[PDB]
């Protein structure tokens, strides 16, 4: 209490806490026996002990114990060693928590379904919590959430309710005109949500008749308007638009700038643009930690934004799809779950060891991103990313709790009442409730691990900065993309010389292959990254400004029409102590002078 | 090899193998640990034995120990103790299967993501076996499948295919009318499935952008038609038709026999009624293991339907929701995945030890529908229902392997290119695959448990037929609402003279509560069921009949409006040899009359 140590609460890089991990495993495991033998104890035992050393009874076992060493086999040829701790850099995976790897197995044992309340009394009340541990990271006063399979599923829902919301206003017109008197069609499809929902919540009795009229009809799907993502987001969201029905071509791309952050400006221009065409905007998508580079979107400005197109009668639902970034927010908590204030924040970062060294970690835009997601509608949140919880676990938050009842269909006493998908294990919720009850979704938890993983990100990045390697004559220098928003690094290799853009791109797809499954053993390979393409279908002239940089030209950008980044999401805790960094800094280069000799050589 | 020992395969109702489970989970977490290690030996542990002493290490450890007994006390407290022998009879759980709870937690220690098949080669290996093993299971020639988070979403995404492939011609029309020359647009409007497949195959280079201009646009979905559901099953499904764009008013039921089946006749005259009013039938989704009563709908009944209304130029999409039913099919096939004649299936069973006692087991009707399963076009199926796999784990199964191009976004390469969610656990692949390995999907695996769990609920359903109690001076009698299609058993209690339908519901929903967590510690009940309404506006008059055979009137069956029903899904194993069942008979007779001794004195 006032501190926490992080490296008791993972199995370990090396299988450290092993035999701790297998102590309270088992601990766990004679619990569950323990608490299934007392039940009914007047009972004798179905299965006999003449019946345990029976031929046929062992030549079952040894069946069973064949398939499972087949399945270690298969996991131990192929699978990636992420749980190193200074040699993978590249997906969004490393170790996952203990304490939700026990919760998950010892749960599991129960097998209770999380759909209804009387299949698990117990992980349905931990659903509910959980639910509510997720609005208060995202400082809703009065909001819910709940674990969703992933954060595709939760994007989805987050467009479900968009698309419910914005068609009510013509669903009021039609089966209780009063609710919206004197309103042009123009203002329904402008009504901001909080008005949308106090109206609903007026006709209490007319609520069922009022959403049988509203998208759930399958009417008014082409009336509610587009649905503006990032451009390097656009091809992800075709997904939830074509499943939702709005359809494709309802998707449009708003540039990003050379940060690849959504440029508000640009924003703006499509925003009014529709306006004047009467064209509403369904919603609006801003991405906390994106995918491909780790960029937080100015959540702020497009919440003001919005704030003055309200002035002119113009507004848009604002989804969050912090899906990656989404635990970070606790960083920016005290314990009594306030913001904290950007002047005092390396202060609190000091005193609570999210930090090790006190300088400027978190630029004021990042930080101001972070604090305006409390305005926002809903916001996809993964626990089996930044949450460090094991697949599968994605997470939605809604701002009101009131906007459940526009999904809906009739604590929860079916869960699966105001939910999208049906079936869910009561296992996930007690996974993700221990994490959250071993580190609190602020400074004091969540927030140590999250500055761990950024400070580890931020060593990285200077690493690469200063790194030249001579192989053959040649002699290759590395250049990052840009200054991480979050803890995600992205860099390339480039012939100093070399002025053929293609060839660049080939150099670092042969890094990416020799550092990858593709070429050698995975289990032998001594430096893993991953690889992204930046092309101008998706990005548009967003790279140009690095490719420039680079002394390659605007025609050449053209000719390759993409640039091939490397990328390092930098998900280890323990990289964020300079000389444990420094054990790891010349195995890198080591590891990659012996990757670039046999590229050239 | 020849016959398979059950009991070898649970952890037991006592815990009976807890040790053999306790041994494997430990050798397994060591091999995992063991590879861990011995990834770049040479690097030295990060995490110090000076580190591991340390007092924050304590009290983290500390910590983490008291959040996990904050999760066992809540999970002792009320959980449902369903791993009981012959003490609950209700709801669709009963143990997992331990090699899969095994595979499970050992490929969790691995976290892989199985969306890239780079995040986890081995387990995406595995999905793509799962997926051909539940091609296998229905007998697909040349189909596919993959596992799904629920089963709900698989019929989600059953729907999503339908309502794409409808809108398929319309989009050749556009893009290539080659394709579809001289048809009129009704025509388009019923081609068969492969005759679409066959054109789009086709049109290789053209096949993007006639997916473009098909119900992906958003355009046309209220061209294609309505969804026809049983009648039992119509509210369910109408979240899948909001979700997917067609809408609540496309959802058609279909009314369901005095067996809870689909009628086929009134099938027929909706179809032929909707045909001439040109409104095409975008689809009919017939049931095999229904929610609430385990009716198995007559699937070769509507596929021969369908083969005669294609003479007269109307045809259907069929999805078949096997949810709870579909591992029930390896029942029927034989070692070299061949159906096995109804002839010779008491022969097989006998051999197999698939049934202790050797008589009609299954009906000739039941094994007719199961057979046609063939000739759908897609199938949902649980592993986490009667494949005896923990939560979460669906599946969806489709006929023809070229379908998955009419849905897809660009062994796959990505998974997630051809399927509804994102993210996805390789640990849910790896605990399905071994299932499926320890148990083969014909009669020398799940067929012989498949057998216990009816041969069970057979003879829990004689058992019930034969009961009566003596309470106070009234008399208490059991009647069974059908003889059970699969494993599921449903009962009401009646007052024996009472005529009031209303009081029935009563009485039955008064042993429900005694027999659950409503009234009492669930840990202390002695005898568990379940319960579900009957009621008019979801069954229409399908329970008049057996309301008529207990005594009641139509006029009473109107007042009511409803019967009150108890249900037990028999999915224990251990029921299937009549001594031991009989070891329990009592001790649920025993405890009923305490039961309804409370009800009423």
């Known amino acids: ?35 299934r033998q007392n039940y009914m104890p007047q009972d004798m035992p179905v299965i006999s002990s003449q019946e345990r050393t ?59 379904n999380n759909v209804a309340y009387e299949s698990s009394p117990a992980t349905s009340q931990m659903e509910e919590e959980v639910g509510h541990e997720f609005a208060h990271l995202m400082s809703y006063k009065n909001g819910w959430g709940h674990i969703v399979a992933d954060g595709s599923l939760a994007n989805l829902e987050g467009l479900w309710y968009a698309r419910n919301i914005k ?27 909080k008005e949308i929902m106090d109206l609903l919540e007026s006709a209490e009795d007319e609520i069922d008749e ?27 969201w075709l997904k939830a638009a074509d499943i939702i029905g709005i359809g494709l071509d309802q998707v449009i791309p708003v ?64 989804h969050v799809d912090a899906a990656y970034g989404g635990y970070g927010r606790a960083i920016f908590l005290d314990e009594d779950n306030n913001f904290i204030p950007y002047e005092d924040l390396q202060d609190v970062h000091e005193e609570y060891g999210v930090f090790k060294e006190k300088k400027e970690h978190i630029s004021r835009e990042v930080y101001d991103a972070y604090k305006a997601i409390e305005l926002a509608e809903s916001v996809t949140i993964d626990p089996h990313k930044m949450g ?20 809906s ?45 950024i400070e580890g990100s931020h060593h990285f990045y200077n690493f690469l900065n200063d790194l030249t390697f001579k192989v053959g004559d040649k002699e290759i220098e ?59 279908p998706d990005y548009g002239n967003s790279p140009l400004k690095f490719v420039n940089s680079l002394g390659f030209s605007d025609e050449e950008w053209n000719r390759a029409g993409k640039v091939t980044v490397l990328r390092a999401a930098v998900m280890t805790p323990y990289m964020n102590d300079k000389e444990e960094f420094d054990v790891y800094a010349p195995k890198i280069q080591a590891a990659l002078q012996e990757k670039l000799e046999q590229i050239y050589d």
């Not at 009417?219 to 649905?227: D, E, P, S, V, Y």
């Open 1 to 35: 209490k006032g501190e926490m140590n992080l490296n008791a609460l993972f199995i370990g890089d090396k299988a450290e806490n092993g035999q701790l991990y297998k102590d309270l495993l088992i601990d766990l495991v004679d619990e569950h026996l323990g608490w």
């Open 54 to 112: 029976s031929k046929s009874y062992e030549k079952t076992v040894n069946h069973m114990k064949d398939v499972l060493n087949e399945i270690s086999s298969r996991m131990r040829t192929h699978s990636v060693p992420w749980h190193t701790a200074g040699r993978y850099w590249g997906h969004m995976n490393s170790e996952t928590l203990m304490p939700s790897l026990l919760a998950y197995n010892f749960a599991m044992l129960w097998n209770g």
């Open 167 to 193: 068609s009510l206003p013509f669903a009021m017109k039609e089966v209780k005109p009063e609710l919206v008197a004197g309103k042009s069609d123009w203002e329904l499809l402008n009504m901001p949500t």
């Open 210 to 236: 009022i959403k049988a009229h509203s998208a759930r009809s399958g009417k008014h799907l082409q009336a509610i308007g587009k649905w503006l993502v990032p451009q390097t987001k656009h091809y992800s």
């Open 255 to 318: 540039p990003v700038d050379h940060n690849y952050r959504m440029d508000i400006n640009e924003l703006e221009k499509i925003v009014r643009g529709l306006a004047e065409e009467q064209i509403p905007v369904l919603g609006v998508v801003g991405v906390v930690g994106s995918t491909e580079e780790g960029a937080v979107d100015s959540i702020d400005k497009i919440i003001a934004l919005r704030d003055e197109l309200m002035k002119d009668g113009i507004y848009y639902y604002v």
């Open 388 to 407: 460090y919880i094991p697949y599968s676990a994605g997470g939605i938050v809604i701002q009101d709790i009131r906007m459940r009842d526009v999904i």
């Open 409 to 453: 269909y009739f604590i929860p006493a079916l869960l699966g009442a105001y939910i999208l998908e049906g079936s869910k294990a009561g296992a996930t919720a007690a996974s993700v409730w221990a994490a959250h009850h071993v580190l609190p979704l602020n400074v004091a938890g969540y927030g140590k691990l999250i500055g761990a993983s």
């Open 478 to 536: 590395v250049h990052t993309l840009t200054h991480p928003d979050f803890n995600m690094v992205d860099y390339v290799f480039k012939e100093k010389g070399n002025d053929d853009l293609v060839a660049m791109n080939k150099l670092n797809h042969d890094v990416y292959d020799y550092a990858s499954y593709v070429k050698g053993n995975i289990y032998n390979n001594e430096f893993i990254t991953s690889h992204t393409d930046f092309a101008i």
